[PDB]
Design a protein around this ligand. Structure first.
Ligand SMILES: CC(=O)Nc1ccc(NC(=O)c2ccc(C(C)=O)o2)cc1
Ligand SMILES: CC(=O)Nc1ccc(NC(=O)c2ccc(C(C)=O)o2)cc1
Ligand SMILES: CC(=O)Nc1ccc(NC(=O)c2ccc(C(C)=O)o2)cc1
Ligand SMILES: CC(=O)Nc1ccc(NC(=O)c2ccc(C(C)=O)o2)cc1
Ligand SMILES: CC(=O)Nc1ccc(NC(=O)c2ccc(C(C)=O)o2)cc1
Ligand SMILES: CC(=O)Nc1ccc(NC(=O)c2ccc(C(C)=O)o2)cc1
Lengths: 355, 355, 355
């Protein structure tokens, strides 16, 4: 009984005990810990165990994608080290999540086929640029006390697959053409099992995986760390589903969760992560999730002309917008960046402050 | 004699006496006053009477457009209230003009036809987002002491009609395709009555109305409040006309005032409104109006690829550029934002300061 | 012997002795000096003699292009004077390089043919807007202590040739269509003389000249002022060549140096000019040059949809990114803007500081 509770407290949330021990151990095993934490940080989670769960999901989805993600995040961490960035930040996985996203989405969008080893070569360079660009953004955004927010990934993944494009002999990408025909959406044709399955599929799309089992694995990883993040994740994916229904989105897109990943990320960040969890904050999170869906439709349409995907551009632009709003209410409380942690610590910090 | 003068002083400029009385009256009538002030604030005018004049013009142009504008501005005001934004700002109509523009231009660009009630549903949401985005912009721009400048509207109206597009089953928009053929502009074909009628048509296009009578109504509303704003309005529309002639613009576009609304807004703001009215400031306003026309040609061409209109993107980007320039002359005086009012108060404040 | 050394010291680097004398002489000859310094400032060089060398190269390439460049830079200087901008900045050519680039590239991209005198009319206006926009950018960027970096030129040249476009009756521009066919790049077809000749051709493309002799003239102008700038120039052009090979770029583009001008500018700025010259800084400069090539491929592809060129947008966005990165190493030292001069003075200032 007490043992199970102690174990639950230990694998929950940022592993403070595990993090304090790691400093002592060997450098390579530390690097592995930082890579795992960064792999979990896409979901705003600082849990190495959730990182192993995430990598299990990625291995389940596609082994080439998992390899690209691993090499991307490890080289992002190494580049953060060689540039002498803050090791508190590297050890918290704040520089590796951009790398894993870069690797995963270059694997996803590459038309060269599975096990195209040359794709590692840009995967390294874009990952090495994940720290640089991150710092370049942090400086601009630290003025308003806003986080970096996956913006580096976006710039890099787009910068790659607009520089190469579909008609590139070395690194071809998938053809993304803008919609030039009216779509006959039939409500009778809609399938509800797939619609309600879009929640895990959206949680999976956060990493680029379209498999529902991978999304369930991701939710398990979230619930190991923070139940608030899990709740806001499901709510964000549901908001994306409903919004896609409301904007006459093609059904196959809602089924594949392409309307959910931006919304889930927005709901995590604007819920517990940067704003103190209050009912006002939770409704702000749902509103930010709805806005984010519009951004996904918009940024998807505006970037389909360039042959580019809309990838996390929507979240950043929504979460940044909702983190910049100034109100006269003391219930929509914006946390300082250093103090920010998983939503439970944020809630405890908020409550102590008020007392 | 003295009575007419007193009445003129009272309906002129920000109605200080009317504003001080309103605080006392009932909440709903206050909301109506704030809605009317916001409707007049597109023209940078804080006059409720000019707001009634503007709504008369909108009713004259299209009753569906007027209804969408009214619902948009009322919901922008309500959203500003529920988010606990400054009531000095809401009472000055600084949160409702974006809403009325959103409603009007969604009505204008919707291909679903007149009296498409479902268009109210996005008209509400984009209007509710007018405060949020406004604050999101204000924070960034308050650092340089600049105004939001209708940027929220732009983001929202574009975000809508790039998310939906022409090929959307629920909210179709008009097809805006980029120019793919050379145009044979004939100077002999030019009609001068329509060219010189483009001044009121441009003042109308500020709100989306292409009717010359509506533009005359708008000028009457301006002259009730501030003659300087009226003069700069006519000058801006004329600058847009001349520039459109100078850039080989199609004649039908100049006739319909599509070259004037950005220029008139730029000339109002860079003339009396944010810069103290000096001959140097007035020439800066004319130069900003000319720049703005180039932006309209440019932003129109760059956004026609996305199927989007260029709507007020040009003004903001010009007025912001001309408000950021630093000179060593004390005659190009940039006013602080709180002190800014209608150009007559700005001139009086400037002159007192110098004395 | 001592005489040759004294002369070398005098035509080297910012001509401090010549600059101090000029203040005394007549206003028109001063204006000529400032125009020449601005013509040399595209290469980050404050040497009037290098300005004469640059204008000799431009006259060699195309006399229409040279005339447009001269009129653009002279009107940029005049506009900087009439707006009462800092004469320390005007006398250093910090306001004329944007003008010469605007004139040169409007001449380059105009489809109206050689000696189209009407092209002078926009060449004047865009040049007159070079100071305004410059100040508009400086204010934003002085907060982070970064330079304007030729961003004004970019905005203006693009703003022109997106406002006019290929199908414009008065100011037609060249057709730039996005790639819609796969290219069969053959390594056997590659010619090495042209590949290695791409270094001077890239240095020429910095000003828009595709002639190798003009590039050699430009390198001579650089070596008169600062050998470090010459070394970083050749290294940047070589990096652009190698990157273009690495991204499957068409061979004719690498031969014409279209992959080098952004890289050479990035390597100059991130090498000696704004960062103190250290081996860490030099590797940062090479990395910034490689990033810049990706930007050129990307910004070229993203802007080819609009019918626009990618012109120096890549450099600014790379140099700005690499100037915003914050590290914990004291060897990547960012110089303050006022202190910045040619790389030799930067190195001497750095070394004195450390002592
Ligand atoms: C002192 C300081 O600035 N600390 C600080 C800086 C940045 C962040 N941001 C994140 O952890 C983060 C942002 C976005 C994301 C994802 C995966 O979307 O993850 C937290 C704290
Ligand atoms: C016709 C068309 O627009 N297709 C299309 C649109 C958008 C995307 N984007 C994604 O699938 C995606 C998955 C995961 C991500 C992330 C989190 O970066 O981004 C692919 C294809
Ligand atoms: C303390 C403070 O920031 N006050 C303050 C803030 C914002 C504004 N801006 C406006 O009224 C405004 C800007 C643009 C427009 C339109 C319709 O174009 O109208 C004035 C004063
Ligand atoms: C082929 C093409 O580009 N057509 C095209 C271009 C631009 C517009 N924009 C407007 O009409 C407009 C009117 C009023 C407004 C405002 C103030 O927001 O914006 C429509 C159609
Ligand atoms: C006090 C202060 O801000 N000084 C200051 C301001 C701006 C610059 N920038 C340049 O000289 C410059 C930037 C970019 C370029 C080119 C041709 O690319 O040339 C230096 C010093
Ligand atoms: C199909 C296509 O993309 N063509 C294409 C692409 C890019 C350019 N840009 C330039 O040539 C250029 C030369 C010099 C400059 C500068 C320094 O401003 O910019 C032309 C044509």
């Amino acid at each position: 009984k007490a043992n199970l509770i102690k174990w639950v407290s230990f694998i929950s949330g940022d592993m403070a005990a595990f993090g304090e021990w790691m400093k002592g151990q060997f450098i390579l095993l530390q690097i592995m810990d930082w890579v795992l934490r960064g792999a979990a940080q896409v979901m705003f989670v600082n849990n190495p165990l959730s990182g192993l769960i995430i990598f299990a999901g990625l291995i389940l989805q596609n082994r080439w994608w998992a390899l690209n993600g691993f090499v991307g995040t490890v080289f992002a961490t190494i580049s953060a080290l060689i540039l002498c960035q803050n090791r508190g930040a590297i050890a918290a996985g704040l520089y590796g999540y951009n790398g894993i996203l870069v690797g995963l989405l270059m694997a996803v969008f590459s038309n060269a086929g599975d096990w195209y080893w040359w794709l590692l070569l840009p995967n390294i360079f874009m990952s090495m640029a994940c720290p640089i660009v991150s710092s370049a953004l942090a400086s601009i955004n630290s003025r308003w006390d806003l986080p970096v927010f996956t913006l580096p990934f976006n710039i890099l993944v787009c910068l790659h697959m607009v520089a190469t494009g579909h008609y590139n002999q070395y690194f071809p990408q998938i053809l993304i053409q803008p919609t030039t025909s009216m779509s006959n959406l039939t409500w009778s044709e809609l399938d509800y099992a797939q619609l309600f399955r879009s929640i895990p599929v959206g949680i999976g799309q956060v990493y680029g995986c379209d498999n529902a089992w991978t999304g369930g694995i991701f939710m398990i990883a979230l619930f190991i760390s923070s139940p608030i993040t899990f709740a806001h994740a499901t709510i964000g994916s549901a908001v994306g589903m409903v919004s896609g229904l409301a904007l006459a989105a093609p059904f196959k897109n809602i089924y594949m969760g392409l309307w959910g990943y931006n919304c889930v990320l927005a709901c995590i960040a604007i819920g517990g992560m940067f704003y103190a969890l209050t009912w006002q904050t939770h409704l702000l999170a749902v509103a930010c999730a709805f806005f984010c869906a519009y951004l996904g439709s918009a940024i998807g349409n505006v970037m389909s002309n360039f042959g580019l995907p809309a990838c996390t551009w929507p979240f950043c632009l929504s979460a940044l917008t909702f983190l910049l709003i100034t109100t006269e209410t003391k219930f929509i409380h914006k946390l300082p960046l250093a103090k920010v942690a998983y939503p439970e610590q944020n809630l405890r910090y908020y409550w102590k402050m008020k007392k």
